[PDB]
DNA sequence: TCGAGAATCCCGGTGCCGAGGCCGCTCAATTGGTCGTAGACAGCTCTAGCACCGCTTAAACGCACGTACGCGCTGTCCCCCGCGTTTTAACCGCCAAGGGGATTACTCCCTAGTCTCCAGGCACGTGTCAGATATATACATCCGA
DNA sequence: TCGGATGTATATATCTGACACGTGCCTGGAGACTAGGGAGTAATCCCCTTGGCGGTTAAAACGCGGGGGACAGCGCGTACGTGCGTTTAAGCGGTGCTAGAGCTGTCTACGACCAATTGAGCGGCCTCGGCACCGGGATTCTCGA
């Protein structure tokens, strides 16, 4: 499952217009992708600990939240 | 008995004061509660969702529109240092960011 | 044939997602790839569609601060263009890769 | 079918207070929702810190008050004090 | 040539025309007398007209000691060297000061009164006669202030006459700063307008302007709509007092014998503590009382507040509601709907829109005093505006501001920051119960009013110098 | 201006010191929107009968006082948060910071 | 005698580096922290620890920021730390 | 009254070299110096309001220790 | 009764597990507190003890050193992955920085 | 004077045991102190936040395991965890 | 500074689904009284923070010089950008299933609370042995000859 | 690339002050119950999560021409490090003082807890209009000379 090139170019490029990106390498986009896999391993980790711990096999939207919170990346609008 | 008066009309709050209190009750702080520390703190919760909501509503009516969209609050939260600097690990989900482009990419 | 420069099309894209409060990654491909990594803590799991976008939201916002970051590491070093070693310097100073 | 309760009705009558023409949307309803929960456990939590400092059993205004000076940033915070005290007396009138 | 026995519309008098079917005065000839402000460069075809500010901009407590020097010169004590103020020799509040009396030409106190013959009050402004309650602050500020000089004196004997009424002007001016930012303005505009126009203090910016601007003049007027009806005065129980407990305000306005001959101020004050304002709503804009029956004695008719305040904003050249609008990012209303959207109000945008025809037309009086108020303020979004600029260029432009280093020293500082008013006035009444802390926000005894032996007093312990 | 001061002038002189004469007392107004006269400079919206502003006829102001700010004085509402202290602070500042004189 | 620039500088960081002594003269520090806490409260009282703990706490603070300022420094292709990498630093750590 | 020149520029030369610095700008010392204020008013503001709320004189080191605490700056070695 | 047998002594652990519960009932943390949370706490605080201990004591040791001092507990953090993570936000008094140099800054 | 207490016994009983040549100072016993108070308030607090998260009013050791894997990094936390479960399993022994 | 082509702004109908108003009712907030333990107040004790005083003296300060580095300019090319065509799958709209989230009833076992007591741990007092402090040595290491 | 030339780790004494230890006692943890309510365990309902099909078409990808900017020379000015001699408070060690932290005793008053009552708010159900939607007309930001 090599769902990480999912993530194409183009949608790296528009997340760095967003950012205010002009000029962009063309060995960026792996590195963008590693850091995109290593930050969602860290949050995920995280909301799969806080869904384990309420004996549950759905990761619920406050699972998330609580997980973004924990590494002081707290989320409104999800609860 | 006499005709039941909730406590934030006693205080003249909207924010609910028996609820506040038991929250801070049950909400493992300290073994006791004042009976002014509800108040303080349903006016301070007031006052804050008062600011934010006027920030919110003005952003809205810049953008003529009706109601109120993440973005609205977004953008009344951005724009505001010390609301910033309270929300500064804050994401708020639908808000977007900030138009800012930096001055040398300019052509 | 009309042509614009090179640095018009990047700008006008600057100025044109930075209004916009959409997500920016393709909802499949980004929930394909979130119960991938999801795969490697725990097994047959399942995602609120909640849940799923607030973790798309999350990755978004924290990517584009890091573009952020990225792009005045860049600039410091008297330079346009976006590189690797920008990205590693400012998540180093933030502490990330510290 | 729980009786879920939030702060729905109390954002909604400060709306009003404030903009009585201008609505609320659901996204921005949770949004406000956790921003008042954010920072009433901000405030609490700041509290109880300090009421365990001096080895204080309660929370009275004085603890909720200095929670306040030190987390809410500049201003804020000193206008957070005034709303707050004059809750306070307002309460002790009747 | 004079707008109070002339109608014709000729410099510097442009009076008021009464339309047809109107409610008081049944003769169209006859017109509300008006006076044209003093332009700044009279004589001049080219420079703009514009308007001068008769008193200093600052919040120096100028009502206190004055901006000119002969009117400085005349409220000082000059028969001795404890740099006290000039003080009644004639009559006493039960052993206690009063402001001393002024000859004016045209001296309009005794017109009030004929009996009486009690003359106007003296004090740092020219209107200071106009109300017995306005009158009676005036008596508190110049008692503390002698009070101060003398418990300065006393703990420092080695200092002057001239160093004593020097600190103590500063200490007042000091207390009017703390006073009016700390409690005044937040319940004007609100803890919204207040914290965006009013942040936090950083130091003294002597490139941000601190002149007062032109539309202040007639966007502070907010307070023409809180004049109750009636004046209240009240006795030691706190109760309605014989005779004449209320009086009509008409029978009030620049009358100083009530002040002389009627036990001082210690009534008045206690009817100010003791009396809630009216609420401004927007069907009740002003009473009739200011509306219609304004100055029946000084003069030959009644006067009209409202219409007084949007001919003064045309007469001084103010930008209508639309440009004051678009100063503060607020939408500018064009038709009818707009007006009803941003005035809250159908009946009332309705009727603006047919007396004047655009929104560009209305004045930014009717039109501040027109849109609901702020939350837990008094004025609306556009006044709020206006006085929260005005008020933050007072204060950041301020060297002598008594947060500034090298004014008041730090300890001098922390003992500044314990006054209120109600220390004031039972510092310098004979009132034993005052009102809790927030004057402004107390109105019901003895709901929110304690025995204020508990207030400490001002420590000058800081003052000793060595 | 002296080069040094403890305590403040009379008139409010010498606080600025890049620029003295501003701030002090009797100094003519300042304008954040440039004057909107009848003419532009000398006279006030209303002066000369029939001219209109911006196109539209400058209405009476004690016929906008009847329509709009004339109300029955028996339906007063008290303000049950402010007092008179209020009112009297309000003229009390305005008689310290703003006051623009007029001809006798 | 003499040696070249660059050499006595490398000796410093080599010979600080070793030792955790506090780099700062303590009188000094105690004068800026009293003259500090001056503006908050009158007839302050300090503990010897708690100057103390203030000194070791700015020390590691400046220290940490030092090392960012340099890290900067080396992106940019130079040697010598500017006040634009300082403010640099605390931009991207989030302090600015 | 001007105690933060008392932070001698061999002072902060002597941090910069515990900080890896080889080479340093002239311009760094006073940028040093206001880092240096901005932080300790932080710090020094969140110790006396704690010290004030315990209604105390003297500020205690442990005050000291629950301002950096809630900086996010632990520091060990001082009080519990 | 019986001789009072310290809980810690049961669980085989060098930290107060009667002191752990005692400040885990007091801390306001819960309306309850379990008997099984002290004894975790207790053991989670002693290995992390231990495991900074040992370290700085060989730090010591490298030194030729008899007594620990602040610069070895540096020494031992921040030369350990996992404890320079744990500890990232913490200062240590006394304690110094760890001897690095830029290979730039190096002679050539 | 009134006793104050640390765990300043117990570190030099680890100490003793780990080094039984190597001894410490008072500062590094400070340091030790409040290392082992920063990590109990850490791990006390994301307990009572699970607590709380779940509608129970009790702290266990399942919240303290998963505290201790969300606070203590990769493979630490393992080694923690281990010690832990090991302590609770003596003592559910005697 | 002006045509061509393209991106965006901004009007006008459309209907649609989401926000707002209304209706029951129930669980939580209010009203009325007691208990007693926490906190406010007053008083006494004795650390320890505070303010000179005198002597070294380590270090801060300021200067002369030159070498290494920051700054800027020049040239290459190749890597990035924008457009045209084609393909690939994201997306929207049912269709169906079913596994798990959420709710409800019973109980029983684990935790709070109370009483006694005794031993771990704190504060005290001490001496002796690692450690900072001199001194000369043999290295450790840098700069033109 | 050696002679000295500066710096320093090291082997050998030398006080010294602070840490490891012995001791008294005291107060908090341990043992032993009892009472009650929180959650452990089933059990049911539905809802919302997953898999699938199919048509649209929006977007991703491949290719290609070209231009601009990233990076490697190259030189010049300057400022920062290095060494030296003068000055200045840092540090240290004693000295005395009293402000306030800390402990103790009284007392009262305020919050926890309980029982009765009712209404505020929350969920479910219409309903209409704010707005995202589709043409379509201006408006212009830009590029190539
Ligand atoms: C309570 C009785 C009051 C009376 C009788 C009164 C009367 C007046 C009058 C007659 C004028 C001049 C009208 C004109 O322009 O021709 C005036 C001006 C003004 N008023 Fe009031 N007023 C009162 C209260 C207040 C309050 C409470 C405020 C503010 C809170 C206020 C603010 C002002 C201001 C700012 C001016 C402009 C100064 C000037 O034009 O000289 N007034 N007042
Ligand atoms: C005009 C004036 O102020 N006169 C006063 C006088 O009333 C007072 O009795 C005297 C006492 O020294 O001081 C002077
Ligand atoms: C109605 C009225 O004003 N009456 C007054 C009266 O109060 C006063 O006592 C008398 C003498 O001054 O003059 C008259």
Redesign the pocket.
């Known amino acids: 499952r090599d769902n990480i090139?999912?993530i194409?170019?183009?949608?790296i490029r528009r997340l760095a217009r967003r950012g205010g990106v002009?000029?962009?390498?063309?060995?960026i986009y792996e590195e963008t992708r590693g850091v995109l896999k290593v930050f969602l391993e860290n949050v995920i980790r995280d909301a799969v600990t806080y869904t384990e711990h309420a004996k549950?096999?759905?990761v619920?939207a406050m699972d998330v939240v609580y997980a973004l919170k924990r590494q002081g990346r707290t989320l409104y609008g999800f609860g | 008995?006499?005709?039941?008066?909730?406590?934030?009309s006693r205080a003249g709050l909207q924010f609910?004061?028996?609820?506040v209190?038991?929250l801070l009750?049950k909400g493992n702080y300290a073994?006791?509660?004042?009976?002014?520390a509800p108040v303080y703190l349903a006016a301070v919760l007031e006052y804050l969702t008062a600011e934010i909501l006027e920030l919110a509503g003005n952003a809205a009516r810049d953008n003529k529109?009706?109601?109120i969209?993440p973005r609205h609050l977004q953008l009344a939260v951005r724009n505001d240092e010390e609301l910033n600097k309270l929300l500064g690990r804050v994401t708020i989900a639908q808000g977007g960011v900030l138009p800012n482009i930096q001055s040398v990419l300019l052509? | 044939?009309?042509?614009?420069?090179?640095?018009?099309?990047?700008l006008?894209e600057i100025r044109?997602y930075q209004?916009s409060t959409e997500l920016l990654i393709?909802?499949?491909?980004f929930q394909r790839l979130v119960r991938e990594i999801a795969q490697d803590f725990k097994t047959?799991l399942?995602?609120?569609?909640?849940a799923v976008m607030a973790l798309q939201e999350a990755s978004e916002a924290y990517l584009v601060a890091l573009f952020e970051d990225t792009n005045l590491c860049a600039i410091h070093?008297?330079?346009?263009?976006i590189?690797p070693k920008d990205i590693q310097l400012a998540r180093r100073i933030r502490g990330e890769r510290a | 079918?729980?009786?879920?309760?939030?702060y729905?009705?109390?954002v909604?009558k400060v709306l009003k207070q404030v903009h009585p023409d201008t609505?609320?949307?659901?996204?921005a309803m949770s949004i406000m929702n956790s921003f008042v929960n954010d920072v009433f456990e901000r405030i609490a939590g700041e509290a109880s810190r300090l009421a365990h400092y001096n080895?204080?059993?309660?929370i009275?205004s004085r603890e909720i008050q200095t929670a306040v000076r030190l987390l809410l940033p500049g201003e804020l915070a000193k206008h957070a004090v005034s709303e707050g005290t004059k809750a306070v007396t307002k309460y002790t009138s009747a | 040539v004079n707008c109070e026995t002339s109608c014709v519309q000729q410099p510097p008098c442009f009076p008021l025309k009464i339309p047809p079917n109107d409610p008081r005065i049944k003769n169209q000839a006859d017109c509300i007398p008006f006076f044209r402000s003093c332009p700044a460069c009279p004589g001049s075809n080219i420079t703009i007209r514009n308007q001068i500010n008769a008193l200093t901009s600052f919040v120096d407590a100028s009502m206190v000691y004055g901006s000119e020097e002969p009117l400085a010169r005349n409220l000082r004590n000059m028969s001795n060297q404890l740099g006290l103020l000039a003080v009644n020799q004639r009559f006493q509040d039960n052993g206690r000061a009063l402001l001393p009396f002024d000859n004016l030409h045209d001296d309009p106190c005794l017109l009030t009164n004929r009996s009486a013959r009690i003359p106007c009050f003296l004090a740092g402004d020219t209107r200071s006669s106009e109300m017995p309650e306005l009158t009676s602050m005036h008596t508190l500020l110049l008692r503390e202030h002698n009070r101060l000089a003398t418990e300065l004196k006393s703990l420092n004997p080695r200092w002057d006459g001239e160093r004593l009424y020097q600190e103590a002007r500063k200490i007042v001016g000091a207390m009017v700063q703390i006073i009016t930012y700390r409690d005044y303005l937040p319940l004007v505009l609100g803890p919204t307008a207040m914290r965006k126009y009013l942040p936090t203090y950083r130091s003294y910016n002597d490139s941000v302007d601190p002149r007062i601007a032109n539309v202040f003049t007639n966007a502070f007027r907010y307070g023409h709509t809180l004049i109750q009806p009636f004046m209240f005065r009240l006795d030691n129980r706190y109760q309605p007092m014989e005779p004449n407990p209320r009086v009509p305000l008409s029978r009030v306005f620049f009358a100083s014998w009530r002040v002389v001959l009627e036990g001082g101020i210690d009534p008045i004050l206690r009817g100010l503590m003791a009396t809630p304002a009216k609420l401004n709503r927007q069907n009740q804009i002003a009473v009739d009382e200011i509306r219609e029956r304004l100055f029946e004695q000084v003069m030959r008719i009644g006067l009209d507040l409202p219409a007084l305040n949007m001919q003064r904003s045309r007469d001084h050249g103010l930008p209508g509601y639309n440009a004051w609008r678009r100063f503060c990012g607020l939408p500018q209303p064009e038709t009818v709907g707009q007006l009803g959207t941003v005035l809250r109000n159908l009946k009332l945008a309705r009727k603006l829109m047919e007396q004047y025809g655009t929104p560009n037309n209305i004045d930014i009086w009717m039109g501040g005093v027109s849109e609901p108020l702020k939350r837990k303020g008094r004025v609306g979004p556009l006044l709020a505006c206006i006085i929260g600029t005005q008020f933050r260029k007072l204060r950041d432009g301020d060297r002598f501001w008594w947060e500034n280093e090298g004014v008041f020293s730090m300890q001098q500082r922390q003992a500044l920051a314990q006054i209120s008013l109600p220390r004031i006035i039972c510092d310098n009444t004979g009132i034993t119960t005052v009102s809790k802390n927030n004057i402004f926000m107390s109105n019901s005894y003895p709901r929110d009013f304690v025995n204020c032996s508990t207030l400490p007093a001002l420590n000058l312990a800081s003052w000793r110098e060595a | 201006c002296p080069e040094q001061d403890k305590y403040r002038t009379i008139t409010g002189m010498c606080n600025n010191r890049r620029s003295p004469t501003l701030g002090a007392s009797n100094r003519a107004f300042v304008r954040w929107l440039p004057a909107e006269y009848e003419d532009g400079f000398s006279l006030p919206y209303g002066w000369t009968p029939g001219v209109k502003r911006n196109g539209f006829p400058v209405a009476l102001a004690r016929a906008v006082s009847n329509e709009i700010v004339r109300f029955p004085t028996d339906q007063l509402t008290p303000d049950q948060e402010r007092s008179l202290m209020f009112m009297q602070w309000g003229q009390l500042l305005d008689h310290d910071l703003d006051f623009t004189p007029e001809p006798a």
Do not use: C, N, W
């Open positions: 090139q999912g194409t170019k183009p949608a002009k000029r962009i390498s063309g060995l549950r096999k759905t619920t | 008995r006499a005709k039941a008066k909730t406590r934030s609910p004061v028996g609820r209190h038991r009750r073994e006791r509660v004042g009976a002014g529109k009706t109601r969209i052509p | 044939p009309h042509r614009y420069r090179p640095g018009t099309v990047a006008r044109r209004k393709r909802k499949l491909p047959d399942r995602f609120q569609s909640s070093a008297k330079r346009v263009t590189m | 079918k729980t009786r879920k309760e939030s729905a009705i109390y909604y609505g609320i949307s659901s996204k080895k204080r059993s309660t009275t």
